[PDB]
Amino acid sequence: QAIAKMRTMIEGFDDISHGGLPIGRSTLVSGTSGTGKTLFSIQFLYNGIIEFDEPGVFVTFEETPQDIIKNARSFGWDLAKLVDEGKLFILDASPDFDLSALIERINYAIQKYRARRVSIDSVTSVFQQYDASSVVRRELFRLVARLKQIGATTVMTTERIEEYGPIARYGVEEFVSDNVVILRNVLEGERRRRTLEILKLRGTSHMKGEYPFTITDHGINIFPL
Amino acid sequence: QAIAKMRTMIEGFDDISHGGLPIGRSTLVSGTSGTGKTLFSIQFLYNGIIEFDEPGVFVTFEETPQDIIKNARSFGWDLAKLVDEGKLFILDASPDFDLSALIERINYAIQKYRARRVSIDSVTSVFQQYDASSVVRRELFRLVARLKQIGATTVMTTERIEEYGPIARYGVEEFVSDNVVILRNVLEGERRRRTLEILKLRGTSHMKGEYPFTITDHGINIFPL
Amino acid sequence: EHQAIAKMRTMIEGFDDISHGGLPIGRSTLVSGTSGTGKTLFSIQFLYNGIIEFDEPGVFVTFEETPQDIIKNARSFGWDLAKLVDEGKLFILDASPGFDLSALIERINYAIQKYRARRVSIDSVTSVFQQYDASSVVRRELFRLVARLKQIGATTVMTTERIEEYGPIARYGVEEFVSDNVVILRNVLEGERRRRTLEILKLRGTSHMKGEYPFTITDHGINIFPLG
Amino acid sequence: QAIAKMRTMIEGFDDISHGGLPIGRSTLVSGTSGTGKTLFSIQFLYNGIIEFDEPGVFVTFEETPQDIIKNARSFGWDLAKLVDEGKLFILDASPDGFDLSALIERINYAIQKYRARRVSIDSVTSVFQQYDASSVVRRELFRLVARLKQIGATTVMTTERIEEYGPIARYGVEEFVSDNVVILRNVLEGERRRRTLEILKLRGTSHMKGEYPFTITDHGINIFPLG
Amino acid sequence: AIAKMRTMIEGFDDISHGGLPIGRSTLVSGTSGTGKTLFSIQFLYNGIIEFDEPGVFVTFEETPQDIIKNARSFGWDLAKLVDEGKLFILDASPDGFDLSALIERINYAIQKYRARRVSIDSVTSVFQQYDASSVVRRELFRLVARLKQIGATTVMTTERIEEYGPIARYGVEEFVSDNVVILRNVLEGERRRRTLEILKLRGTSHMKGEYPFTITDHGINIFPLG
Amino acid sequence: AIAKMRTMIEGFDDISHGGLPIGRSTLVSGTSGTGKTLFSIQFLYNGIIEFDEPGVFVTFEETPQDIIKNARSFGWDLAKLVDEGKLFILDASPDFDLSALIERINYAIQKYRARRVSIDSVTSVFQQYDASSVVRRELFRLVARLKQIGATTVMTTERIEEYGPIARYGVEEFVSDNVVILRNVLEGERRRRTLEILKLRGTSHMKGEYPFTITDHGINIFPLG
Numbered sequence A, B: 001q002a003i004a005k006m007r008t009m010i011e012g013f014d015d016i017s018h019g020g021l022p023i024g025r026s027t028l029v030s031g032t033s034g035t036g037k038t039l040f041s042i043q044f045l046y047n048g049i050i051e052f053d054e055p056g057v058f059v060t061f062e063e064t065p066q067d068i069i070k071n072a073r074s075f076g077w078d079l080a081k082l083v084d085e086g087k088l089f090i091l092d093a094s095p096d097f098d099l100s101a102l103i104e105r106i107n108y109a110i111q112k113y114r115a116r117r118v119s120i121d122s123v124t125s126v127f128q129q130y131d132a133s134s135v136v137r138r139e140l141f142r143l144v145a146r147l148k149q150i151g152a153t154t155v156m157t158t159e160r161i162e163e164y165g166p167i168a169r170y171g172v173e174e175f176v177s178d179n180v181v182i183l184r185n186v187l188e189g190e191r192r193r194r195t196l197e198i199l200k201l202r203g204t205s206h207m208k209g210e211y212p213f214t215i216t217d218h219g220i221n222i223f224p225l
Numbered sequence C: 001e002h003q004a005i006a007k008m009r010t011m012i013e014g015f016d017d018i019s020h021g022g023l024p025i026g027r028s029t030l031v032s033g034t035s036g037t038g039k040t041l042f043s044i045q046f047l048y049n050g051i052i053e054f055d056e057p058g059v060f061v062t063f064e065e066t067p068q069d070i071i072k073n074a075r076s077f078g079w080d081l082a083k084l085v086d087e088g089k090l091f092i093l094d095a096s097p098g099f100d101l102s103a104l105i106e107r108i109n110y111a112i113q114k115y116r117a118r119r120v121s122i123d124s125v126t127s128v129f130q131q132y133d134a135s136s137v138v139r140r141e142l143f144r145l146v147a148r149l150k151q152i153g154a155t156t157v158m159t160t161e162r163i164e165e166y167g168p169i170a171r172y173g174v175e176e177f178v179s180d181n182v183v184i185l186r187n188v189l190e191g192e193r194r195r196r197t198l199e200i201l202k203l204r205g206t207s208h209m210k211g212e213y214p215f216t217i218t219d220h221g222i223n224i225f226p227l228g
Numbered sequence D: 001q002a003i004a005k006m007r008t009m010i011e012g013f014d015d016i017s018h019g020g021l022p023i024g025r026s027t028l029v030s031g032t033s034g035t036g037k038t039l040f041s042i043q044f045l046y047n048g049i050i051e052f053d054e055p056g057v058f059v060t061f062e063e064t065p066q067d068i069i070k071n072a073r074s075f076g077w078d079l080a081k082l083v084d085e086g087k088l089f090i091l092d093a094s095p096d097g098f099d100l101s102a103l104i105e106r107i108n109y110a111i112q113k114y115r116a117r118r119v120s121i122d123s124v125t126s127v128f129q130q131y132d133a134s135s136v137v138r139r140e141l142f143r144l145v146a147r148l149k150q151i152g153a154t155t156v157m158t159t160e161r162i163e164e165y166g167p168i169a170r171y172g173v174e175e176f177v178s179d180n181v182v183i184l185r186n187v188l189e190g191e192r193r194r195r196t197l198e199i200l201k202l203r204g205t206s207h208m209k210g211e212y213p214f215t216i217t218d219h220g221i222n223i224f225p226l227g
Numbered sequence E: 001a002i003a004k005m006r007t008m009i010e011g012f013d014d015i016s017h018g019g020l021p022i023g024r025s026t027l028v029s030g031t032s033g034t035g036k037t038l039f040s041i042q043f044l045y046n047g048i049i050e051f052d053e054p055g056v057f058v059t060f061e062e063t064p065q066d067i068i069k070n071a072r073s074f075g076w077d078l079a080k081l082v083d084e085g086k087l088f089i090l091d092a093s094p095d096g097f098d099l100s101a102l103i104e105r106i107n108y109a110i111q112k113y114r115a116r117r118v119s120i121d122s123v124t125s126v127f128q129q130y131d132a133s134s135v136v137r138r139e140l141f142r143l144v145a146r147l148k149q150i151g152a153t154t155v156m157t158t159e160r161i162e163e164y165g166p167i168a169r170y171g172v173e174e175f176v177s178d179n180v181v182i183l184r185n186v187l188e189g190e191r192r193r194r195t196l197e198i199l200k201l202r203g204t205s206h207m208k209g210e211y212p213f214t215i216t217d218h219g220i221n222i223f224p225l226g
Numbered sequence F: 001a002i003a004k005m006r007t008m009i010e011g012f013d014d015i016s017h018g019g020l021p022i023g024r025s026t027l028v029s030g031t032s033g034t035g036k037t038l039f040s041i042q043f044l045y046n047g048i049i050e051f052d053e054p055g056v057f058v059t060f061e062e063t064p065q066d067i068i069k070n071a072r073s074f075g076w077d078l079a080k081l082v083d084e085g086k087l088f089i090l091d092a093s094p095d096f097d098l099s100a101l102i103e104r105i106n107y108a109i110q111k112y113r114a115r116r117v118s119i120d121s122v123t124s125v126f127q128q129y130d131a132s133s134v135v136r137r138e139l140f141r142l143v144a145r146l147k148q149i150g151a152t153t154v155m156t157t158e159r160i161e162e163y164g165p166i167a168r169y170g171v172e173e174f175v176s177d178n179v180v181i182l183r184n185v186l187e188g189e190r191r192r193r194t195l196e197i198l199k200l201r202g203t204s205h206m207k208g209e210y211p212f213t214i215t216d217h218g219i220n221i222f223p224l225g
């Protein structure tokens, strides 16, 4: 029957989303630079491992595994240990148009590590890396559709350049994803404020509009209203 | 005589449209992501079947039949049963420029299932999937023309980026369709509000402007004013 | 002769007041609007009234909508276009699908001579350039058509598409400049409600009222309220 | 001495321009559709003929001479009589590597033949669009303007624009090549239109600034100088 | 400190804390009729009259004759200065893009007339005359860099379309120039107001923001504020 | 967590909670005349004078001599520092791949034992060779190699609006670890300078815009609480 959700245990998120992220579906998490997209994607995996012993695969296209690990120490998280224990796997897909080969490497890692959670950060970059903007819808669809067939629950980050403009970069990514989460970092009166919005969850309910959040030493904390 | 309408049974819609959707004509349903387009197009067919034993054909370019069926369980509708009974046919037109082949597959399904209601979701995506943005007016016209000839009553969804900008994506879709419905999901003061507007019905009358609506466990509910 | 230009009554309620007597004879009038503003309705009412009131035959040129659907939609208003086609008073010319309008223009001309038409509606010209990806040549080919119609002496309503209520008059930024006369139909959304207005922006060589005038579309077609 | 001006006798305009249009120079008159560009350019020639016996050449790329003549009857002007007397020439440059050289020599032939002091060219936008030559607008508008200055014609050239408060002309270069720039506006506010005329620039001389209201009536253009 | 040369344009030397940086390029950008040509002429004229510093004026469209005629509006006699060899007007109007030939022509004139000041009016136009927009940064950089090597002090005018939009036309010109002056002619409430701003002078100080100015029979007059 | 090196630019080390993250790249973006070059020169000069940390300055347009002359504006003697081998000005102006440039930078960093690197401006070198299609690829290659080398890098970039895109090509901020935005906002005919740390990966900083002034003593930023 109806879609089930997995608790993210990210403070306030499971309230906003009426239970967590839809299982076996993809969630687009989109935001301007420094909005906390990587943090959200890491905290998803980390909580999966710590709260439910669900292994996670982190796919990176630019940042090195070592820097992902190093930056997570800002939040007191020891990702190197989780890697050593085989609970976390960071797949380095950085450079040295068709996503089929990558998709197969990712599927391979999911199977190998028995992963229930996957984060991909950021899919925007791989198309720009290889001047492939003409084929974004088709290739993103290929990736999302395969992850659905595998039954992976996935967070995929993407980039945007305006807080109240396009949801992502090419005006197609939100339509391909099952779920859309928008992180904003709005500048008004010389000051910033962070908000999180669940725009869409296909096949299930969620709270609407923007909710304040903070990034602290404990990662993301969202305040439902 | 003046053009006849078929009831959608979508609460409030047949009020706003003065009796329903014009029979044998095409209706564009456009909106940003997560506005309720797929829901509207599913509810149209589902109601046709349950209320009038009127079979329907659902054309998908991306979402699988399985996920379409799963997401509809959010509302307590059992679409698998209807597929099993031959009352609903979900035509999978996802990938493995001319719409003739697609058109013939749709016609075949209309004649085979004896269907009078057709939903096509989303016609935007198919142009993007084959980079055929330059031929949109010509090919959307071919599609709509042929469905008019066949006598189908058709809901076609399309994608947009702004709540008050272009009706659809390419600036031509609204002019090729006989009828235009716009779903909006406006963000103001950090909160969303859903509205539906019937912009146009050729050859007949309708209520004007935006009417609020909600998506609940019973599908779309529009409040006429 | 040596008088200023004469006008032909549309008999569209209020329009002949706004236009100080109707549409200038032998000239082209652009009627431009977002989707659902009443462009087809205007262009139909122009021919229909010309036939019913003045026995002036009309030619309607369509590039997408079928004759049968044009006829059917006009019954919304209790008009019987089928009857008029039967009597040879209305001809609906189906023009549905380098780039050159010369052939089309000759077919239109042939139709005008054959039916002895005084009034012509072309709906919509926008679409034919989009149907063949011919935006580069719009000014030249639209001029070819308008100039030939003027030469013939036809009184023509040409509809065109726009996508903003207060942006460009038409789609390509040239159409208003090629036509002799320009009418803009708006359907403005404000505070969740729509309102319809009609503006005569320009009539070359003659006077008209200025600004937007409200109008409704009812069972009798377009009804415009002059203000003053 | 500084540049001299010829009177347009368009009511109000010679006050706003501190004397009239600079002699031997090109004046761009730009505006959205129906702002009065053709009317300004006709009235400029008509007044030249009637008040000063200064013959005029009118260059058209789309409107026929017969329609130009017919539309001027709206204002009670008999342009056919002036054509018959050899005082007005309407040069039909309608259609039937883009280069305006031949056009320029047809214009010069007319100027020399009619001993014309005044020239109106309407609209210069249209000829670039007719031949899909937008890429070359600055070079060929400059050729035209330079050649007319060489000939010493005082020229009104009309151009099209899409916004009341946006670009001066169409391609963002026309106002830079012209010596003088006048902007006709027809602003819609509160469902009502108002007409205003602005002299943006006259090279080498002075003029009033900002927008001045005007009306188009049976007597042509009438401009109200505020102060 | 880079040193400055007085423009002697009333108020400008106050706004710029002494004048234009010597041996460097100053971009002067504005919509049509803002006073760009006037500024660049007044710069050369004053250099001659006040300091006997010879000037070269490079035009791509306007003839020398019309430049001279239009300056009579301000009671300046440029013809006399051309005669005396203090002012050279270099007519570069027309009959892969590469400014090298023009640079050599400009360089020749600077040596011959021994010019210390140079005005180029307008560099926008030359790129559009030869549909060469794709290469503006590279070629404007070539021009600025060589003028600097020669040690010329240069005013280069450029065109813009909006009073509060891009500084120039191609979004690169301000970054190539050492110094940037924006002339505005803002329309508000049906009335125009002229203002001058010095956006940037590399390596030295200047006043900030917009200062009102007028164009009169005496040329540009800028009103410094406070 | 990541460590930080003090810039000693007055106010900045407060705003950044300690300085620039060591071994990472910091984008400094701004419209013309915002103080980008000045910031990147003060970074190296303070490094040399206060900590005896050698610096490499990379220029694509401004000559070494003018960089030196312009720094005299602030009482800094850069020619002396170049003479002592404390500062190396790498002239990369002209006479698509950034590999050559990168090997020259690395060589200069080894040779002069530099801890600090400023590159001014990264924008311009892509415009100089019309290589805008390749910005994200090539900026990534430069940033990645400098992270490997462990240099602490300031990279300036150009923008054309105060409240528009962070940089010029919509990708530079996503590739950099850290992002600083200098603004020069015109309002009511007056300019005001502000600095904003938009983002520091892996660590904390103050948010929003802070006023600053450029004086005879360089940049001076006022933190606000």
Ligand SMILES: Nc1ncnc2c1ncn2[C@@H]1O[C@H](COP(=O)(O)OP(=O)(O)OP(=O)(O)O)[C@@H](O)[C@H]1O
Binding pocket: A031, A032, A033, A034, A035, A036, A037, A038, A039, A040, A074, A075, A215, A216, A217, F173, F174, F175, F176, F198, F199, F200, F201, F202, F203, F204, F205
């Ligand atoms: N311990 C901490 N306390 C407070 N804020 C922190 C801490 N650690 C990191 N941050 C904040 O988190 C932000 C970094 O977030 P993250 O890398 O997840 O963003 P992003 O959206 O992925 O950026 P980019 O788009 O450039 O990849 C930093 O900019 C910093 O403001």
Ligand SMILES: Nc1ncnc2c1ncn2[C@@H]1O[C@H](COP(=O)(O)OP(=O)(O)OP(=O)(O)O)[C@@H](O)[C@H]1O
Binding pocket: A174, A175, A176, A199, A200, A201, A202, A203, A204, A205, A206, B031, B032, B033, B034, B035, B036, B037, B038, B039, B040, B074, B075, B215, B216, B217, B218
């Ligand atoms: N049982 C329910 N109760 C309330 N809301 C629900 C329920 N089920 C789904 N929804 C809402 O319906 C919205 C999604 O609807 P739908 O899939 O029709 O949107 P769409 O316009 O087709 O999206 P896209 O354009 O991305 O395809 C979800 O975003 C969720 O907010």
Ligand SMILES: Nc1ncnc2c1ncn2[C@@H]1O[C@H](COP(=O)(O)OP(=O)(O)OP(=O)(O)O)[C@@H](O)[C@H]1O
Binding pocket: B174, B175, B176, B199, B200, B201, B202, B203, B204, B205, B206, C033, C034, C035, C036, C037, C038, C039, C040, C041, C042, C076, C077, C217, C218, C219
């Ligand atoms: N009997 C009626 N009473 C009231 N309004 C009606 C009636 N019949 C039609 N309409 C209105 O007339 C509008 C259709 O007008 P029309 O087809 O002339 O518009 P259009 O501008 O030509 O549309 P498009 O640009 O998409 O071709 C309908 O959208 C409907 O609101």
Ligand SMILES: Nc1ncnc2c1ncn2[C@@H]1O[C@H](COP(=O)(O)OP(=O)(O)OP(=O)(O)O)[C@@H](O)[C@H]1O
Binding pocket: C176, C177, C178, C201, C202, C203, C204, C205, C206, C207, C208, D031, D032, D033, D034, D035, D036, D037, D038, D039, D040, D074, D075, D216, D217, D218
């Ligand atoms: N006798 C008159 N009284 C009042 N107004 C008139 C009269 N005759 C013409 N007009 C007005 O003159 C207006 C402007 O005419 P004109 O042809 O000069 O415009 P234009 O700017 O050249 O238009 P386009 O750019 O489309 O060529 C007409 O739209 C009409 O409003």
Ligand SMILES: Nc1ncnc2c1ncn2[C@@H]1O[C@H](COP(=O)(O)OP(=O)(O)OP(=O)(O)O)[C@@H](O)[C@H]1O
Binding pocket: D175, D176, D177, D178, D200, D201, D202, D203, D204, D205, D206, D207, E030, E031, E032, E033, E034, E035, E036, E037, E038, E039, E073, E074, E215, E216, E217
């Ligand atoms: N004697 C004068 N008194 C007042 N203003 C004058 C005088 N002479 C010229 N002007 C003004 O100077 C302006 C001409 O300025 P100038 O030619 O320097 O402008 P520009 O910015 O170079 O124009 P463009 O971009 O067309 O080249 C004229 O538009 C006019 O307003």
Ligand SMILES: Nc1ncnc2c1ncn2[C@@H]1O[C@H](COP(=O)(O)OP(=O)(O)OP(=O)(O)O)[C@@H](O)[C@H]1O
Binding pocket: E174, E175, E176, E199, E200, E201, E202, E203, E204, E205, E206, F030, F031, F032, F033, F034, F035, F036, F037, F038, F039, F073, F074, F214, F215, F216, F217
């Ligand atoms: N001694 C000083 N006192 C005050 N301001 C100064 C001083 N020296 C330089 N400036 C200011 O510093 C600004 C120059 O800064 P800088 O060269 O660092 O800018 P930038 O952002 O690199 O410019 P561009 O992007 O066009 O290269 C000058 O525009 C000037 O306003």
Ligand SMILES: [Cl-]
Binding pocket: A194, A213, A214, A215, A216
């Ligand atoms: Cl925070």
Ligand SMILES: [Cl-]
Binding pocket: B194, B213, B214, B215, B216
């Ligand atoms: Cl809802």
Ligand SMILES: [Cl-]
Binding pocket: C196, C215, C216, C217, C218
């Ligand atoms: Cl109505």
Ligand SMILES: [Cl-]
Binding pocket: D195, D214, D215, D216, D217
């Ligand atoms: Cl009027």
Ligand SMILES: [Cl-]
Binding pocket: E194, E213, E214, E215, E216
């Ligand atoms: Cl002034």
Ligand SMILES: [Cl-]
Binding pocket: F193, F212, F213, F214, F215
């Ligand atoms: Cl300051």
Ligand SMILES: [Mg+2]
Binding pocket: A037, A038, A039, A121
């Ligand atoms: Mg990130």
Ligand SMILES: [Mg+2]
Binding pocket: B037, B038, B039
């Ligand atoms: Mg959908």
Ligand SMILES: [Mg+2]
Binding pocket: C039, C040, C041
């Ligand atoms: Mg229509």
Ligand SMILES: [Mg+2]
Binding pocket: D037, D038, D039, D122
């Ligand atoms: Mg005209």
